[PDB]
Amino acid sequence: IETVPVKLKPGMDGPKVKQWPLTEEKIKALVEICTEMEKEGKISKIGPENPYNTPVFAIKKKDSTKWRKLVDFRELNKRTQDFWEVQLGIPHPAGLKKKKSVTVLDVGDAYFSVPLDEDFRKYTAFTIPSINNETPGIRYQYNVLPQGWKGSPAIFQSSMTKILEPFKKQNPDIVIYQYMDDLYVGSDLEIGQHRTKIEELRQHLLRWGLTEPPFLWMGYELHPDKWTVQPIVLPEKDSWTVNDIQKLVGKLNWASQIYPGIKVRQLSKLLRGTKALTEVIPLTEEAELELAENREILKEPVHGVYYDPSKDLIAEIQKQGQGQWTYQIYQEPFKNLKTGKYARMRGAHTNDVKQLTEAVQKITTESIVIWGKTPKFKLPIQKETWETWWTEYWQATWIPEWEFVNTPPLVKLWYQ
Amino acid sequence: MVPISPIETVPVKLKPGMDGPKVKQWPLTEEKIKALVEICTEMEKEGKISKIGPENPYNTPVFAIKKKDSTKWRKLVDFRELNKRTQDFWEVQLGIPHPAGLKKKKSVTVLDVGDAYFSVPLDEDFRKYTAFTIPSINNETPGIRYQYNVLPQGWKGSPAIFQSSMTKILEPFAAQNPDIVIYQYMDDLYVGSDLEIGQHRTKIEELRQHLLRWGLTTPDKKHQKEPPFLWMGYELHPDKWTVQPIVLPEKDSWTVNDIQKLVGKLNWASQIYPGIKVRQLSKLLRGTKALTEVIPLTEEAELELAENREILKEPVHGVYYDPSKDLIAEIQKQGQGQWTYQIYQEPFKNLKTGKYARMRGAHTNDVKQLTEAVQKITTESIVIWGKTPKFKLPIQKETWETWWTEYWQATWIPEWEFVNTPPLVKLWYQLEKEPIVGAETFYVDGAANRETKLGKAGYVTNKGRQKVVPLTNTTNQKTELQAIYLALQDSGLEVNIVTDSQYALGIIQAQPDKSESELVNQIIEQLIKKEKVYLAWVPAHKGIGGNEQVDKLVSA
Numbered sequence: 026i027e028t029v030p031v032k033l034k035p036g037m038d039g040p041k042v043k044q045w046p047l048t049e050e051k052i053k054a055l056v057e058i059c060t061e062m063e064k065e066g067k068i069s070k071i072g073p074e075n076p077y078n079t080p081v082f083a084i085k086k087k088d089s090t091k092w093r094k095l096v097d098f099r100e101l102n103k104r105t106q107d108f109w110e111v112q113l114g115i116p117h118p119a120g121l122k123k124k125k126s127v128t129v130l131d132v133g134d135a136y137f138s139v140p141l142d143e144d145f146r147k148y149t150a151f152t153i154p155s156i157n158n159e160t161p162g163i164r165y166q167y168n169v170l171p172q173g174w175k176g177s178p179a180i181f182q183s184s185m186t187k188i189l190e191p192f193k194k195q196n197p198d199i200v201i202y203q204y205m206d207d208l209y210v211g212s213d214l215e216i217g218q219h220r221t222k223i224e225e226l227r228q229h230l231l232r233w234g235l236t237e238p239p240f241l242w243m244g245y246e247l248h249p250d251k252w253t254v255q256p257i258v259l260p261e262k263d264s265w266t267v268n269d270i271q272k273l274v275g276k277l278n279w280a281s282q283i284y285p286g287i288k289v290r291q292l293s294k295l296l297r298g299t300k301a302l303t304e305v306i307p308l309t310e311e312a313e314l315e316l317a318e319n320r321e322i323l324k325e326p327v328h329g330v331y332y333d334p335s336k337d338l339i340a341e342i343q344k345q346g347q348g349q350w351t352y353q354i355y356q357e358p359f360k361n362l363k364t365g366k367y368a369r370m371r372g373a374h375t376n377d378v379k380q381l382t383e384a385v386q387k388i389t390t391e392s393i394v395i396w397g398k399t400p401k402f403k404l405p406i407q408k409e410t411w412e413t414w415w416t417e418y419w420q421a422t423w424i425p426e427w428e429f430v431n432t433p434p435l436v437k438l439w440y441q
Numbered sequence: 442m443v444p445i446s447p448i449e450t451v452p453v454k455l456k457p458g459m460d461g462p463k464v465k466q467w468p469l470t471e472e473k474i475k476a477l478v479e480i481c482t483e484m485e486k487e488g489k490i491s492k493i494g495p496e497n498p499y500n501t502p503v504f505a506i507k508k509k510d511s512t513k514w515r516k517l518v519d520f521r522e523l524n525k526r527t528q529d530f531w532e533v534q535l536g537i538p539h540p541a542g543l544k545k546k547k548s549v550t551v552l553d554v555g556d557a558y559f560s561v562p563l564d565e566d567f568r569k570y571t572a573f574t575i576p577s578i579n580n581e582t583p584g585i586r587y588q589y590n591v592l593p594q595g596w597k598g599s600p601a602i603f604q605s606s607m608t609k610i611l612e613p614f615a616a617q618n619p620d621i622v623i624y625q626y627m628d629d630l631y632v633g634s635d636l637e638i639g640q641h642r643t644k645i646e647e648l649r650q651h652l653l654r655w656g657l658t659t660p661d662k663k664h665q666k667e668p669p670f671l672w673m674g675y676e677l678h679p680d681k682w683t684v685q686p687i688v689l690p691e692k693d694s695w696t697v698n699d700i701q702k703l704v705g706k707l708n709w710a711s712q713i714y715p716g717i718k719v720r721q722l723s724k725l726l727r728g729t730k731a732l733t734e735v736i737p738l739t740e741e742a743e744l745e746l747a748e749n750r751e752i753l754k755e756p757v758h759g760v761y762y763d764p765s766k767d768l769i770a771e772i773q774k775q776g777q778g779q780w781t782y783q784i785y786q787e788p789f790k791n792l793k794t795g796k797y798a799r800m801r802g803a804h805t806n807d808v809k810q811l812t813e814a815v816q817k818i819t820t821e822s823i824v825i826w827g828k829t830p831k832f833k834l835p836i837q838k839e840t841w842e843t844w845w846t847e848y849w850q851a852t853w854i855p856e857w858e859f860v861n862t863p864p865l866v867k868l869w870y871q872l873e874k875e876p877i878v879g880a881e882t883f884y885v886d887g888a889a890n891r892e893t894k895l896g897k898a899g900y901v902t903n904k905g906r907q908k909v910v911p912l913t914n915t916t917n918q919k920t921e922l923q924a925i926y927l928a929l930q931d932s933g934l935e936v937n938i939v940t941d942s943q944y945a946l947g948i949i950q951a952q953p954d955k956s957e958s959e960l961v962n963q964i965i966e967q968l969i970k971k972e973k974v975y976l977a978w979v980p981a982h983k984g985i986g987g988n989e990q991v992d993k994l995v996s997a
């Protein structure tokens with residue numbers, strides 16, 4: 026009811042980010058949504074003395090038929106002060122990634138109950154564009170905590186902690202973690218029991234609300250205890266061709282940057298002659314021993330791997346074909362904190378870009394659960410292709426940072 | 442008196458840390474002062490400016506300028522300094538409508554709202570920063586001091602504030618009359634509709650009555666302006682549009698400047714004249730910028746220019762957008778990294794045309810450029826029409842499928858159909874996924890000495906075939922490519938090639954069909970002739986044979 030004073034970081038002005046082009050269906054959706062929000066007092070129209078801007082678009086969340094407004098606050102988020110006044114920060118719960126089931130809730134609607142500092146509102150300006158710029162874009166700013174802004178969970182935190190206390194008190198073993206507009210709720214209960222608890226939890230928010238959210242009802246279920254990782258594995262063969270051995274030596278040379286004691290000397294001697302690539306080459310004793318010794322090394326964890334919360338997480342993705350995608354998350358090269366592989370791209374059979382967009386979202390979710398922040402992506406796609414299309418497939422309420430990889434990595438072969 | 446609603450002021454600030462302007466008034470002739478005194482007395486009577494006391498410390502210079510072929514003076518206030526100090530505003534005018542996105546109209550009426558502009562009051566707290574001084578005759582009295590009460594012409598905030606104020610005033614009228622469109626440009630309102638003329642005229646009179654609520658009067662005596670309109674370099678007509686006349690000059694010689702202007706006109710023309718080309722002409726402007734330099738036109742530029750003259754020989758027009766119909770975009774390859782397109786709804790009736798040029802870079806291929814053109818057209822179409830057009834592309838469906846499924850990057854183009862109009866985009870080569878049984882295996886290598894620039898490239902094969910060639914003025918990277926080239930040159934229609942060049946793999950895995958490197962082009966030409974090529978990579982210096990042997994032969 027009283028606003029928390031908020032400021033941008035020293036020597037920084039507000040965001041001035043161009044609105045990207047929106048289709049007719051999305052403009053009509055945003056006009057309908059913003060008219061209602063204005064009526065509810067959540068946003069107000071602004072005049073030309075406000076020069077700031079943040080882009081807006083609209084999405085459909087997974088399994089819903091209603092459009093949701095999504096503001097891309099990435100620039101404002103970078104420019105906004107850090108929030109340590111009341112608390113140093115909520116130690117991320119390491120137990121969350123160990124739970125059998127984690128359900129993700131959209132609790133962003135709760136933020137609209139809190140007014141936003143009057144002096145800060147101008148920096149939340151956004152524009153609903155018109156087709157062909159035929160009419161002036163409709164300009165608004167927020168009067169209340171906006172969805173997608175990093176200050177919202179930070180300011181709302183004391184209110185959230187008070188709302189959830191009886192549930193936490195009644196269910197002390199449940200792990201609850203807030204990230205942006207998301208609430209992550211983990212338990213080790215049988216799913217049926219688990220879902221009822223989730224619904225129990227919803228009732229607290231609803232109850233609190235009425236003292237109506239469009240998306241609280243939904244539930245994204247994760248099972249991080251089942252999340253799967255990718256150690257380095259070598260082929261087991263009875264017959265090795267020159268080509269097979271070349272691939273093996275290549276893979277081992279690469280793996281030797283990750284694991285010190287990997288050796289290729291004896292295997293490499295096999296590739297000494299100048300044999301047809303498809304010719305079968307018997308392994309020497311020395312080579313078999315070296316292969317066996319290498320296999321044993323690869324069963325162990327990588328040395329000197331640690332997470333530093335002061336450093337960026339980096340995520341790389343490779344397209345492997347046939348709907349399959351591999352990825353690695355690291356802070357230091359060759360020191361992977363997580364690796365993985367997807368094949369389950371839902372409804373994206375003839376569309377690579379939709380598959381990649383869905384992979385990015387899944388990886389970001391994993392990242393939030395494990396470390397409580399998003400990685401910077403290296404995407405195997407041309408900028409222009411990504412930037413034309415990703416918003417068509419986006420279903421999350423946050424947006425990570427990304428850069429583009431224009432030269433084919435040789436490494437793709439080694440994660441294949 | 443009929444009460445009129447006041448216009449709400451937009452609050453205005455100087456930039457943080459900045460104070461208002463304190464600029465010296467220039468001396469003026471006695472004649473100019475008398476002129477300025479008269480004008481300001483008149484402006485003061487009309488309420489635009491007010492005399493101020495000696496307390497105000499700010500000043501902006503004022504000038505009197507002689508209106509050519511007249512004995513009448515005009516006032517000019519030089520707000521350059523105040524403008525540097527004034528906050529940034531939302532500028533609504535940044536994006537102009539593209540004619541191709543407009544809808545046909547039966548009637549478009551123009552209303553002069555020139556009187557309303559000086560009726561927009563200035564934020565009271567900001568007026569002090571607009572102070573100016575009429576010098577006195579002979580400097581024997583204090584100069585006459587004024588400040589503005591309304592948006593001053595030439596001040597940074599006037600266009601945005603004027604436009605936003607008019608929009609807010611017009612909003613209820615537009616909302617409750619969804620059967621007209623209203624567009625503001627400068628001091629005029631344009632009102633279009635499809636109503637029968639009597640009803641359209643009624644709407645105009647109703648708009649005039651609406652505008653009177655804020656005391657903004659318009660001239661009964663109707664505008665001189667009526668369709669067709671000259672606007673932003675276009676001609677707008679009730680049911681078609683075009684660009685203003687494009688006339689390419691005759692010259693015996695061309696300077697840098699002539700050529701920049703030539704390309705500018707062609708670029709402008711290309712939004713409705715199909716097939717315009719500018720590559721060879723633009724190539725002449727490469728790198729050099731003394732505008733007066735005379736550049737001999739290449740034969741290629743002469744050909745391009747002649748082709749453009751033919752394209753431009755008679756008027757071409759676009760039609761307007763019908764939202765009830767699909768949009769269709771068709772693209773053709775023109776050569777030398779150039780692409781051209783048309784967007785239409787009905788056959789032979791373009792809404793607009795345009796072109797796309799290949800991006801700067803080392804290597805490229807036609808499929809990648811076509812893909813880029815599709816994204817460009819898609820984004821342009823979302824801006825202008827709010828939707829993606831259906832594409833008609835000169836690439837077979839099977840070619841696209843093979844391309845995107847095998848390409849190392851994610852890639853996508855939206856709904857499209859093949860159109861069989863040469864030249865077709867095709868894949869010129871496809872590397873094998875597995876080593877080829879029965880094909881000779883060439884182990885290749887090259888190395889160069891970084892000091893002498895001498896090097897060697899060559900191969901050894903499982904058949905005992907071998908070659909080493911000595912090279913001068915070369916580099917490791919070139920010798921690595923030369924070795925692969927030799928293997929392609931000397932092999933049969935099917936070949937396995939084993940290289941340790943990470944550089945060469947990175948190029949070939951990008952699937953170029955053309956390169957800035959002559960050597961890469963020679964390799965591509967060889968690949969095109971083969972039936973099957975498998976390219977295998979191994980790490981250098983690992984005792985890996987064939988490779989190790991050739992390395993020794995080439996590193997000597």
Ligand SMILES: C[N+]1(C)CCc2cc3c(cc2[C@H]1[C@@H]1OC(=O)c2c1ccc1c2OCO1)OCO3
Binds near residue numbers: 070449605606609
């Ligand atoms: C910010 N407010 C106070 C509210 C809404 C609004 C929305 C705007 C705008 C100005 C304003 C101002 C204010 O509200 C008005 O209706 C208005 C405003 C300022 C100046 C005006 C106005 O109408 C005539 O001139 O420019 C274009 O979009």
Ligand SMILES: Cc1cc(/C=C/C#N)cc(C)c1Nc1ccnc(Nc2ccc(C#N)cc2)n1
Binds near residue numbers: 546549631671
């Ligand atoms: C952008 C614009 C410029 C001018 C005028 C600018 C100037 N000068 C006049 C109008 C009315 C508009 N606005 C819109 C909006 C939607 N359809 C149209 N169609 C349309 C406009 C003019 C003519 C004609 N003749 C025909 C159709 N115009």
